[PDB]
């Protein structure tokens, strides 16, 4: 065939797959699994995700509370100021802004 | 063929009257939430004379006034930029 | 103009052959499990039972409600249409009929029945002042409450009973 | 009155500390190119031009100065954002082509109904995949904040 | 079939009878009914065949299997003809044009008189091949030919029983 | 202002039920959820031909012809 | 246009012609396969996503609450906003 | 709208339980009835998930007091809070004056597990 015969032969062995070649049991199981995903799995994932959000944000918040108790300070704004935009209220973010101010200003 | 009392023309006006009001409100609420964030991050602050303001800035930030290209972006907007920025 | 979205045979004369075939499909004749015993008079029906069939037995098959439904415009050969569906409810509501479950099982199809989206054009244009839309809503509620897993087998058994029927639309 | 947009404090620090230029990688280039333009009715967010400047600077990886550390953290947050933009185009392309091939034998109405929705879904799926593989889902709130700090700010006198 | 599951003759009879009535009861005319169901029917039919192989000569199970095979044959054959009819009618609808106006109209089948002679022959062949499935053949192919008749005036034996 | 313990189970559970209830309702209860099935059934189903030209087939075919398969 | 006039229609379940009904069944499988694959997106988000304010959080737990049992005095105003 | 009836309504617990059980015992021989098995099973699988969440937050409660801000009656106030923040620049024009230095106090605490003193 030549180089063309090698080009055509390779595409014939690369484009060989079809769903008509699949066995009967696997053909149905793929449909069953897909239908199970849409009906059962898809609605559950959002709920499992809410559980983890709460648990992970509970860890983030109690760590601030642990820090304040160890510090024995009632200067709440030092730990988290709720009047500052975005996430800047957190003590660490406030310190980052302070570093920026000190370096930039003379 | 074409009639004003047609199902097409009366379903297109009904949809407009029904949805356009809801939509305008909905988009507006998003636009409002955007402004609330923007005004808390970089509120537009009006200065009298741009030249004096620029000097105070260069002095406050320790920037050499020679290396800063000041350009007028709009009639009411000027902009200082680094001239030696990669 | 001729009836909407119909094949025009000539000028204002529509082609309503599909409508006639769909009606033959619902088999609009009384069915009973036991043949009238010799020496028997009329099958008993109360005035109240006869009242149930009031607004449904007056349909003159004008086919206006049919050619006013946007769902019959789009899927004429799959959706039975308002008039046929009301006639099916007439025979599902007739106390004398004894094949209520068979009729409900056959009509319980996505294309045959649930293509009605409640446009209400059928009730607005009815020349006899009937309410096909209300009847279809009742028939959908009755089917939903009475559905059983064995309905599909019931349809199959009736189909076997019609094996020797002639060539034309029929229960199957 | 007159407004004056000046480099922000983070920009000032980044310019002071830049040690050299930084080679932009191939995916960063493509990500910046595939990034939608931003119309600045008011200036509060970073655009593709500001992001390039951040990624074109180079900082000392060992420097222990707290200021330099902030700059490096910001540059890393900007990099994850930029390379994440490379997933939108693949998603939108497959989100139209695959549906169109499947409905290729169906009427025009069906393509008008389906293709617009699958396109947005494919683009969304691509964006999710890109942001996920760029490690945006594991960034802390401090990392994301530093990467979102504006590069231009209206000057506040006094 | 490759399986380790074992079933009694009573269980085999139940599975086969369930599949037979399920297929014969499903509405064949609606394409989505066959497209969605046939994958499940084929998986079940393979299992039914494996467990009913001993009972092919059984006086109860044997007839059920034979009817089940015949129904599946009729289901595939009828679906094929109606699929072609659906192709012809959709070619005709596209020829009408956008909004029925004819604006962006496709070219219109030219051998439509001959394509209707092909379908009607197939319809009659199905009737002879599957004599105990006429109700299903009329539901799918018969009604399909009645729809075509509204577009092209052609003659078939049962045309009068379809109000033509 | 300085309680020894804080009761969070009631509030958290209330939020879980409200959020979960709204999402599960939207996904399961309404018949609107089958609106994409109705639209497809009405306008897309049984409307296909293999004897009419379409761009995706033409594109794949030409690109193959161009590369000699 | 024109259409083939010598079609060999299916005769039984084992002598089948390729038609658009069989193509539609392949579409059902391929669309369902996509659904199985796209489930990996939402599942991956829930597994890999972390909601933490900074790197401090983990250090606080390693040095102050290693067993997740240490009790912190509660000052309501801190998180109540007032 | 909708499709042909495939099973019981959602509120019919005993009927749905039957279909959910058949998902494991009797294989489906049609798409409609397989889909019904999933929907009826979805009722119980989703109920179980919500159930565990509620159980887990009672048996192992959240320790922070932030969740008091997630009370239903406080939801409106929180919405107004995000729309009524003071306008300004995120950057600090002037040093913040706090009675405590959390950054420094945190450095010492992480190093010695002891306050600076
Ligand atoms: C306990 C018992 C309880 C009762 C029974 C429970 C099961 C029944 C449930 C109800 C019926 C469901 C049904 O119909 O069955 C579905 C189906 C079986 O159907 P069937 O028709 O009855 O089977 C007969 C067929 O002939 C066989 O079916 P088939 O072959 O046609 O297809 C089955 C297929 C099911 O899947 C499919 O058919 C679909 C496949 C994918 C389709 C394409 C998807 C495309 C999308 C991609 C997605 C990802 C993208 C990500 C992108 C990012 O199975 C697989 O997934 C296996 C495929 C791979 C084969 C092996 C090839 C590699 C070489 C060998 C590797 C060996 C390594 C082993 C590692 C072991 C590690 C410990 O699946 C199974 O049930 C088989 C499961 C096989 C794996 C099981 C492994 C775990 C076993 C233990 C579980 C229990 C743990 C208990 C622990 C203790 C707890 C306290
Ligand atoms: C490794 C190297 C690459 C190997 C490629 C192998 C391809 C192959 O074997 O194809 C076999 C396949 C043979 O199988 P068959 O069952 O006979 O199918 C024939 C047709 O494909 C019939 O196709 P159809 O009409 O049934 O529609 C196909 C479509 C059916 O599904 C759809 O049409 C809907 C797809 C989703 C729509 C929503 C858009 C979502 C887009 C997401 C994009 C990604 C986002 C995340 C990632 C972002 C970037 C990082 O299938 C899928 O998209 C399913 C994908 C399942 C993936 C499971 C893992 O042959 C072809 O695909 C040839 C068709 C001609 C080219 C079509 C080009 C379409 C546009 C690309
Ligand atoms: C904006 C982003 C979204 C854009 C669209 C995304 C498009 C890609 C979707 C990819 C996911 C897989 C899609 C289905 C795969 C096929 C499964 C299948 O065959 O099942 C039987 C399938 C029906 O499946 P089913 O699960 O038994 O019943 C669905 C019910 O929802 C009852 O099911 P259920 O009880 O489980 O109810 C759960 C319900 C829960 O429902 C909802 O979540 C509510 C929203 C429903 C409508 C939302 C869309 C409204 C826009 C117009 C939709 C129609 C235009 C087409 C859209 C694209 C369709 C691919 O979820 C669903 O609707 C099912 C999940 C997949 C839906 C995908 C399309 C809508 C996504 C909407 C996401 C955003 C919604 C926001 C709504 C606004 C308010 C927040 O029936 C057919 O196949 C009918 C075909 C008729 C025409 C003939 C076609 C050829 C036949 C050969 C096979 C064709 C297969 C492919 C069909 C699609 C071709 C375009
Ligand atoms: C144990 C008993 C069980 C009883 C079960 C009863 C369940 C039903 C009651 C409703 C519970 C759901 C409450 C909502 C979730 C908690 C609220 C929350 O997180 O907000 C706080 C968060 C708090 O964040 P924060 O950062 O402001 O909190 C800090 C507050 N300061 C500053 C004062 C310290 O609010 C916000 O962030 C503002 C936006 C809130 C937007 C709320 C939108 C409503 C969401 C629910 C929609 C429900 C849809 C269904 C109804 C249909 C409507 C058409
Ligand atoms: C035929 C009918 C069939 C009915 C099937 C009913 C299925 C019920 C589905 C339950 C799913 C629950 C999953 C919750 C996932 C979310 C929670 C999460 O992420 O938490 C992380 C948690 C861990 O997080 P944590 O925060 O709890 O961790 C603290 C806990 N300690 C201190 C112990 C570490 O782990 C899990 O996800 C575990 C979840 C266990 C779920 C167990 C469910 C069993 C269901 C049995 C049903 C039996 C039905 C019988 C039918 C009979 C028919 C004849
Ligand atoms: C026709 C009808 C027209 C209707 C038009 C009006 C409609 C809209 C009305 C106004 C709605 C306003 C909603 C405002 C919501 C804002 C909530 C918000 O900011 O959420 C983020 C908020 C906190 O914000 P930050 O302080 O920036 O913290 C960042 C991380 N440290 O995060 C949360 O706690 C979100 C909680 C979500 C819980 C849901 C379950 C998961
Ligand atoms: C034809 C052949 C098609 C081959 C497609 C291969 C697709 C692979 C997709 C996953 C790759 C993810 C990846 O590289 O993520 C890492 C990388 C970040 O890690 P780094 O720190 O830069 O380097 C890691 C090692 N130090 O993540 C990203 O680049 C962010 C996400 C980018 C967007 C998504 C990917 C875009 C480019 C590939 C598109 C492929 C499309 C394929 C379509 C096929 C259709 C049939
Ligand atoms: C819904 C489950 C079933 C899904 C089935 C289809 C699968 C394919 C389509 C995608 C499904 C949904 C995927 C969900 C997971 C991915 C979510 C995602 O990428 O969100 C982006 C991002 C995640 O936040 P990051 O801070 O970047 O990282 C989080 C961890 N720190 O989300 C957001 O910030 C979104 C905030 C809420 C926006 C709400 C807009 C209005 C409502 C839109 C939906 C209707
Ligand atoms: C007569 O032309 C047309 C059809 O044929 C009956 C349609 O199906 C439909 C109906 C389809 C949709 C998407 C509403 C339209 C709009 C159309 O123009
Ligand atoms: S329009 Fe009224 S009278 Fe005429 S067929 Fe319909 S229901 Fe009967
Ligand atoms: S107009 Fe049609 S959609 Fe129903 S309410 Fe009447 S039969
Ligand atoms: K009756």
Automatic annotation (TrEMBL), chain A:
What name is this protein filed under? Uncharacterized protein
> Which lineage do the record's taxonomy fields give for this organism?
Eukaryota, Sar, Alveolata, Perkinsozoa, Perkinsea
Whole sequence portion shown? 66 to 171 of 173
Automatic annotation (TrEMBL), chain B:
Source superkingdom: Eukaryota
Protein name, please?
Answer: Uncharacterized protein
Q: What is the lineage of its organism?
A: Eukaryota, Sar, Alveolata, Perkinsozoa, Perkinsea
UniProtKB/TrEMBL annotation, chain E:
A single Pfam family it belongs to is DUF6827
Looking at the record, the residues that make up the DUF6827 domain are 9-164
Give the superkingdom in one word.
Eukaryota
| Name of the protein in its database record | DUF6827 domain-containing protein
Q: Which species does this protein come from?
A: Perkinsus marinus (strain ATCC 50983 / TXsc)
């Amino acid at each position: 065939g030549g180089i063309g015969g090698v080009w055509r032969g390779a595409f014939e062995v690369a484009s060989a797959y079809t769903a008509l070649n699949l066995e009967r049991q696997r053909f149905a199981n793929i449909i069953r699994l897909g239908t199970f995903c849409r009906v059962v799995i898809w609605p559950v994932i959002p709920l499992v995700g809410l559980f983890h959000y709460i648990r992970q944000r509970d860890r983030d918040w109690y760590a601030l509370e642990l820090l304040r108790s160890r510090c024995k300070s009632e200067d709440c704004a030092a730990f988290y100021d709720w009047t500052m935009p975005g996430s800047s209220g957190h003590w660490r973010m406030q310190n980052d802004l302070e570093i920026i101010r000190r370096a930039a200003n003379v | 063929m074409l009639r004003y009392d047609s199902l097409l023309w009366q379903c297109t006006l009904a949809a407009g009257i029904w949805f356009i009001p809801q939509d305008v409100a909905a988009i507006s609420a998003f636009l409002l939430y955007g402004r609330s964030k923007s005004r808390t991050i970089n509120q537009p602050v009006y200065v009298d004379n741009i030249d004096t303001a620029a000097n105070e800035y260069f002095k406050r930030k320790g920037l050499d006034p020679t290396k800063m290209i000041m350009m007028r972006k709009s009639s009411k907007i000027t902009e200082i930029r680094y001239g030696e920025m990669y | 103009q001729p009836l909407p979205h119909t094949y025009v045979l000539k000028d204002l004369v529509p082609d309503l052959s599909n409508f006639y075939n769909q009606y033959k499909s619902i088999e609009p004749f009384l069915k009973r499990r036991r043949a009238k015993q010799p020496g028997e008079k009329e099958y008993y029906q109360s005035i109240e039972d006869r009242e149930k069939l009031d607004g449904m037995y007056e349909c003159n098959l004008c086919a206006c409600c049919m050619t006013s439904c946007p769902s019959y415009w789009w899927n004429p050969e799959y959706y039975l249409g308002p008039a046929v569906l009301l006639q099916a409810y007439r025979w599902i509501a007739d106390s004398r009929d004894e094949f209520t479950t068979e009729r409900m099982a056959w009509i319980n199809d996505s294309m045959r029945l649930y293509r009605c989206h409640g446009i209400m054009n059928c009730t607005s244009c009815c020349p006899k002042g009937l309410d096909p839309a209300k009847a279809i809503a009742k028939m959908k509620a009755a089917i939903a409450a009475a559905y059983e897993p064995g309905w599909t087998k019931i349809v199959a058994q009736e189909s076997i009973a019609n094996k020797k029927r002639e060539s034309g639309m029929m229960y199957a | 009155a007159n407004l004056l947009l000046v480099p922000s404090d983070i920009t000032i620090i980044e310019e002071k500390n830049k040690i050299a230029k930084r080679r932009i990688r191939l995916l960063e280039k493509t990500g910046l190119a595939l990034m939608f333009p931003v119309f600045h009715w008011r200036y509060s967010k970073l655009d593709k031009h500001d992001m390039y400047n951040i990624l074109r600077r180079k900082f000392d990886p060992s420097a222990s100065d707290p200021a330099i550390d902030i700059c490096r953290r910001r540059q890393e947050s900007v990099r994850r954002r930029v390379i994440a933009q490379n997933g939108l185009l693949p998603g939108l392309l497959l989100g139209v082509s695959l549906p169109w091939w499947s409905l290729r034998r169906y009427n025009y109405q069906s393509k008008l109904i389906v293709l617009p929705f699958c396109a947005y879904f494919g683009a969304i799926c691509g964006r999710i995949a890109g942001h996920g593989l760029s490690w945006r889902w594991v960034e802390t709130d401090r990392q994301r904040m530093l990467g979102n700090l504006p590069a231009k700010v209206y000057y506040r006198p006094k | 079939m490759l399986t380790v599951d074992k079933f009694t003759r009573a269980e085999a009879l139940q599975r086969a009878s369930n599949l037979y009535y399920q297929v014969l009861g499903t509405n064949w005319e609606d394409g989505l009914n066959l497209v969605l169901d046939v994958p499940f029917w084929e998986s079940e039919l393979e299992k039914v065949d494996h467990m009913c192989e001993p009972y092919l000569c059984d006086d109860e199970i044997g007839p059920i299997i034979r009817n089940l095979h015949e129904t599946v044959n009729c289901m595939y054959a009828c679906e094929d003809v109606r699929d072609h009819i659906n192709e012809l009618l959709e070619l005709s609808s596209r020829a009408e044009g956008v909004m029925g106006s004819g604006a962006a109209a496709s070219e219109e089948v030219e051998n439509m008189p001959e394509q209707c002679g092909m379908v009607t022959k197939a319809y009659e062949d199905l009737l002879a091949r599957y004599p105990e499935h006429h109700p299903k053949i009329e539901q799918t192919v018969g009604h399909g030919l009645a729809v075509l008749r509204q577009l092209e005036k052609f003659n078939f034996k049962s045309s009068h029983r379809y109000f033509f | 202002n300085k309680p020894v313990v804080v009761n969070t189970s009631g509030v958290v559970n209330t939020a879980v039920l409200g959020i979960s209830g709204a999402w599960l309702y939207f996904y399961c209860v309404p018949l609107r959820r089958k609106e994409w099935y109705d639209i497809m059934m009405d306008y897309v189903h049984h409307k296909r031909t293999q004897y009419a030209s379409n761009f995706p087939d033409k594109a794949v075919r030409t690109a193959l012809r161009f590369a000699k398969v | 246009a024109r259409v083939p006039e010598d079609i060999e229609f299916t005769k039984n379940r084992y002598t089948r012609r390729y038609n658009l009904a069989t193509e539609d069944r392949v579409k059902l499988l391929n669309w369902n396969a996509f659904c199985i694959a796209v489930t990996a997106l939402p599942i991956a988000y829930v597994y890999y996503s972390w909601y933490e304010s900074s790197e401090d959080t983990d250090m606080i737990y390693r040095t102050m609450d290693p067993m997740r049992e240490a009790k912190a005095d509660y000052y309501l105003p801190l998180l109540r906003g007032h | 709208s909708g499709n042909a009836a495939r099973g019981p309504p959602l509120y019919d617990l005993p009927g749905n339980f039957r279909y959910a059980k058949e998902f494991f015992t009797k294989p489906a021989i049609s798409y409609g009835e397989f889909h019904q098995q999933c929907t009826s099973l979805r009722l119980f699988v989703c109920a179980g998930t919500v159930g565990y969440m509620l159980f887990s937050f009672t048996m192992w409660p959240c320790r922070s007091s932030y969740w008091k801000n997630w009370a239903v009656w406080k939801v409106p106030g929180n919405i107004m809070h995000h729309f009524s923040k003071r306008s300004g620049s995120i950057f600090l024009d002037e040093p913040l004056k706090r009675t405590i230095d959390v950054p420094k106090t945190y450095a010492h605490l992480i190093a010695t597990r002891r306050l600076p003193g």
